[model samples]
Target: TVALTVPAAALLPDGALGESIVRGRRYLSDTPAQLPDFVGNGLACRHCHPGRDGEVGTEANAAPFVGVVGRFPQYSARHGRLITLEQRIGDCFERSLNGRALALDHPALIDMLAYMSWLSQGVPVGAVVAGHGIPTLTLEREPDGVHGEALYQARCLACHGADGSGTLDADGRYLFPPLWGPRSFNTGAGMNRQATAAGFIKHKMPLGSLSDEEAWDVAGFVLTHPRPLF
Candidate 1:
């Protein structure tokens, strides 16, 4: 399995270029806070990437940026056409963040891309990194929202909050993001997909043990709540 463990300090050198790389990382960690006009959600790029202080949202195929720069101009079934990394980034803004897209010449876009390129330094083009996205799992039975609700109450809702509002530190930033409601990902986001959600919940949720069955159940229950229409 391919692994990417490039240290942040070694990712860039000193000077203007290095500063740009650092800015890019901040943007990923707080997209909406940095670009309020463009981003609509409270979620950060780091949330999906499995980065913040060893907090991986899922195992294998966790959407880490490693090898991303080399894999662009790729096809995306969601787009139903070939796409550039820039376009994919915009897709996340629109669908995942439920936010507007950035201009093609946006500096933030370039910076984010630059950091990914740095992370991809020695990787060959067109290489498929193992565990590049969320792991896919097929549920044996039809996912039940009712059972999922029970699972959510029993296993989740502490970090995410009893009402799904999630908790924040004194600074008002999330310790974790809400599972649903207005601030969460919109209906059109990929996490709304049962299989996709199941995989994510299976590997990275409740901050504790979870069986595959419980994961599916919780995924279904989490998606049952009202969220932005997208």
Candidate 2:
């Protein structure tokens, strides 16, 4: 299995490439604030793809950027064609961010590519890093929304809020990020799918422990509420 390895900052060269990589990281971490024109919702790239130690996407099992560059030019079921990394990023912009895609050659987009490339430096092509993507969870039975509501109130309400409004920091940006509503990701987002959301919650929910069943139910409960249309 290929392990995820984050590059050391000391490896960053003092030049345009270095600058672009840093800029890319900032854009991912502070997307809504940095690219307000491009971001239509409250979520930043880091909201779902969270990281540790100032790295934008270095965490295991959290869709980490490490080793991602070499996996592209792969088939996309949605597009029905082999899509590049840029195309994948565009999809996220249009769906996850609920915003328009940046031009393929846009500087910000290029910078983001540079950062991902830097992260993939030592990774061999065609090798998937362990814990690179979120694991899928599927239950045979429909999720129990009623049980999920209680679980949400008892576990998720603190950060995500009673109405899923999420907490705002002192700077007026979402601290925890909303789960649903006009400000959140739209229905077209992958997170809107119960299995995807459940997988995310099972592994990544902050300050908590949730069984697979609980995660599935909570995801169902959250999706029952309305949000912006795709």
Candidate 3:
């Protein structure tokens, strides 16, 4: 497995390029605040693709951007054609953020590309990162929503709320991020899928180890609720 190595901030070049990277980082970490027009929901990119030390999309098995640059210009089943990283980001805005897509040449988009490229440093193109994206999980039986709700109440309600509206910080951004409802990701978002949600919850939820059935149940319970339309 290829290990993820996040580049240190001290390594940023002292120039406009560095500034662009910094701006991109800020845009991702504070998306709804920094680019309100492009985000209809309360989620920042970090809500799903969380990272550490002021970096976004560096975490493994949670859709980290460590080698994302190299993986793009690749096929997307949703679009039924090849797509670029920029297009992928656009998809996130439209579906995950429940907002309009930025123009292909948007400066903020460029900065985000720069930041992703910087994060991709040392990773060769065509090389797969060990934990590039969320793992897929499936179940033979239908998920048990009742059991799921119980687990959510016991394990997830504190941060995500009884209504799943999530907690808000002083900045008015989601501190923990909403899991459902109008402020959450739309139905078109990948996380809305049962398998994807289960995978994320199983490995990345801020809790102890959960059995596959438990993760599937919780994911089913969460998805049984409502969210924004795509």
Candidate 4:
């Protein structure tokens, strides 16, 4: 696999372009706090990202941005047609961020595009990034949603909160992030899918305490709870 490398924030060109890229990084990492009226949830772009460093799109399962820019105007089964990168970003905002659509002309949108496109530099158009998407694991056993509640309490409750509201900062931003609530990603969000959620949990859950079976169970437990409706 080709190594995916993104530019350092410090190395960004010194000017308005650099500022937009940096702010874009910040907004992506702190979506709700940076845009509360738009982002109704506790999730930042980094909830799934959760990188070891400040960079985005470097983690294997985090949906890295490298080579993503040229892949758009690509077919989407969900949308049933080819879509632009702008549409893709809007989809994440509507579903993942649990937020409203950003105007195509919005500076925030432009800034985000600049950051993501910058990450794609030097890659050939239409080339696939090495670690672009999350990988899934086979389940060793069936999951029990009810029994998994205990696992959640033990492994998840502290950060996500007993009610799964998540520990928010004084300014209403979540330091951890809510699992199930009106503020969370809606039922239509792909993360609500059992296999998808379990795939993420098995490799990336809190402390990675769960085995494949346990992770699937925890996913079942998580999805069984109520959240924002699509």
Candidate 5:
């Protein structure tokens, strides 16, 4: 018979909560500066877990760390079955992370699993049928074009430009590609839906220091803007 000895840290009332918090702090402070390439987007972890707060609508932004463990192995509408935590992590790497899933026996996977298990203490281990507490955004109505125009001027014009014509990046790519225009996601693209667009903007946009309301407001503002040709 094999007996697993859980670490004392894992047994704490918070389970690995305390340690996870500490680790998050340390990772934020030391890892970003020391090894930007390894721990962040250059590697695998940064895409879903961004360091800063209030960056919602972007692809690579912070993921909520708390309350995620209790729900798992539940049936996914997209991928049916009670998926294991390991499988979910692996999937992220394979799909969203754009990297190969680590082997089940890999040390890095073990470390992350251990940490997650610790964090999940006291929480039920299973699929979160209700879905995790992560927030979602959807448009309430077709935004008032007039109000949207005013809101865009006040909130977004400074960096993104008055016409929504994106600026150039150092690499010559558009920094803030014109929304609803030729340079933006094509109308034929699946992202035309209000929910998808709202969700993306709610989680990541504006580049800094805006509240969830701000993100939503700006999203509403942009969606109502005239879809330019080029």
Candidate 6:
């Protein structure tokens, strides 16, 4: 089977990969003054990975690339099978950095993956297999009804109606998708679990805002609120 690792040079969007590699190297050495604020804020991959030396594998740390490329999309008992590398990276954004994942097709993702591909070059694809690793949930338990109501008022009601019925954006597409009673996160989607739903919200909610704590609080509220039937 073909190894599953991404190719580094192939990671960049057409015409951008080469320059990004060069810049990435320079950034590693010189620590340029014009580096992106995220880099300066101590949030770059370099900071966590340190020296581009090796991956740091821990319950909370990312794995290094000795022969890892060939072993993904493997079953994760935490999230189940068919999980993509992108999903794994997104998990790091939420769990490790307390930051949001880049959009699935974002250039930054390309750059990051390209770097990883370079690191894991030539590793043979390993056997496809399942593992028993499950992600532990991190939300604290409290009376969800009250928390949900307050969260709705603060973060959701403006876009999704107080009834959880959703609203139209200026572009006329849904601004906030509906929550329950047959129009959203249907009971049959296997998404009824609070932890699963909350993890998604923790990374990608609040429209354009970027607060993980707020996302968790707001998600907890919405999921627990009682919805009216249509």
* Candidate that would win on lDDT: 3
Cα-lDDT of candidate 5? 0.46
Compared with the true structure, what per-residue lDDT tens digits does model 4 show for residues 1-230? 44677766567899998888888788777788787777767788777765556766557676778777978889989999998998888888888778787888789888888878878787778878887766665575777987789889889988888888888788877777788888778886778888888888887788445788788888889988899876
* Residue-level error in angstroms, candidate 6, position 127: 12
Of the pair 1 and 4, which is ahead by lDDT?
4
Position 135, candidate 3: lDDT: 97
For each candidate in turn, the TM-score is 0.91, 0.97, 0.98, 0.90, 0.46, 0.39
* Model 3 lDDT, residue 126, Cα: 85
lDDT of 2 by residue, 61-120 (tens): 779999999999899999998999999999898889999899999999999999999999
lDDT of 3 by residue, 1-230 (tens): 46788998998999999999999999999999999899999999999999888899998898999988988799999989999999999999999999989999999999999999999999988888888899978999999999999999998999999999999999798888999999999999999999999999998985437899999999999999999987
- What lDDT tens digits, residue by residue, belong to model 1 across residues 1-230? 45665645653598977887777877877777888988777777766676645322223556778777788898899779999989988888887888988887799988888777766766778886676778866788888888888887787876787778788767666668877888888888888788888988777776646888888888888887888888
* Error of model 2, residue 45, in angstroms: 0.1
Candidates in order have lDDT scores of 0.77, 0.90, 0.93, 0.79, 0.46, 0.46
Model 6, runs deviating above 4 Å? 1-137, 169-172, 209-217, 225-230
Of 3 and 5, the candidate ahead on lDDT is 3
Task: List ranges where model 3 is wrong by over 4 Å.
Answer: none
Better of 2 and 4 by TM-score: 2
What's the CA error at residue 106 for candidate 6, in Å? 27
Residue range 155-193, candidate 5, lDDT tens digits: 677766787766655854344555644434333322344
TM-score of 4: 0.90
Find the 10 residues in a row with the least total lDDT in model 2. 202-211
Model 4: weakest 10-residue lDDT segment is 49-58
